[PDB]
Amino acid sequence: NWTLVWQDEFTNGISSDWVFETGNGNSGWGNNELQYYRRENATVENGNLVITAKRESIGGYNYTSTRMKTQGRKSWKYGKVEARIAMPSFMGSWPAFWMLGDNISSVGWPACGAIDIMEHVNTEAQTHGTIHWQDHNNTYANYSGSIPVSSVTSYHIYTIEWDASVIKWFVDGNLYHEASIANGVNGTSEFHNNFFILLNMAIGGNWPGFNIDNNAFPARMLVDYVRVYQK
Ligand SMILES: [Ca+2]
Asked: Which of 109, 83, 35 lies closest to 198, judged by CA?
């Protein structure tokens, strides 16, 4: 059965297991994103993390938001990883709940692997689940599924179950995507290493595009909790 091994319920502030990124990264966090991440865009209100994207200027960028991670504090190999999230829906928005391989520090992205547990862009009536990696031929690979979500602005539960055979994605317990990692099929060896968790909300970028609804700011993503279980 599933045993809880880590959580942040945000009940008494943000856990010291999170580190915050600052700035626009390299080439907009690799995606030509437009935001500058800060600590100040993360707050807690009534037992929920609140990530607020703002029209705010700093360092040559014109929007701010938060990107937080458990890198260097907490990581896991296999498990059930879940968060209860309510996110905004507007043109330019790109919230995510995801994981990266701890070995990113030595192998870089995308060789480290990423497991996107929840992504949403713009005003789509659906959310996506995806894995990204470098395959047997060392070519960038991704494998993505999606599920209709009529109200991303309401709380939904975004989950993966990950074991040495498979990763499965669920929203509200409804299975919608799955990917085999058994034997490192399609060069998925790196999903058999420890990964850390990230939460963020980007503004603009190659996927959502550069048509930004400037009247949708400030915008809030609320996260009731993040939990990890293992067998
Ligand atoms: Ca909570």
From this structure: 83
| Topology (CATH level 3) of domain 1-231 | Jelly Rolls (2.60.120)
For this entry, resolution in Å reads 1.7
Instruction: Supply the DSSP string of 95-137, one letter for each residue.
Output: EEEEEEETTHHHH-TTTT-EEEEEE--TT-SEEEEEEEEE-TT
- How far is the centre of ligand 1, averaged over its atoms, from the C-alpha of 226 (Å)? 8
Residue 68 sits at the vertex; the CA angle it makes with 67 and 73, to the nearest 5 degrees, is: 155
From which experimental method does this structure derive? X-ray
In sequence order, what are the beta bridge partners of 142? 132
CA of 92 to the centre of ligand 1 (A): 27
Ligand 1 centroid distance, CA of 157 (Å): 13
- Could you tell me which residues are beta bridge partners of residue 178? 168
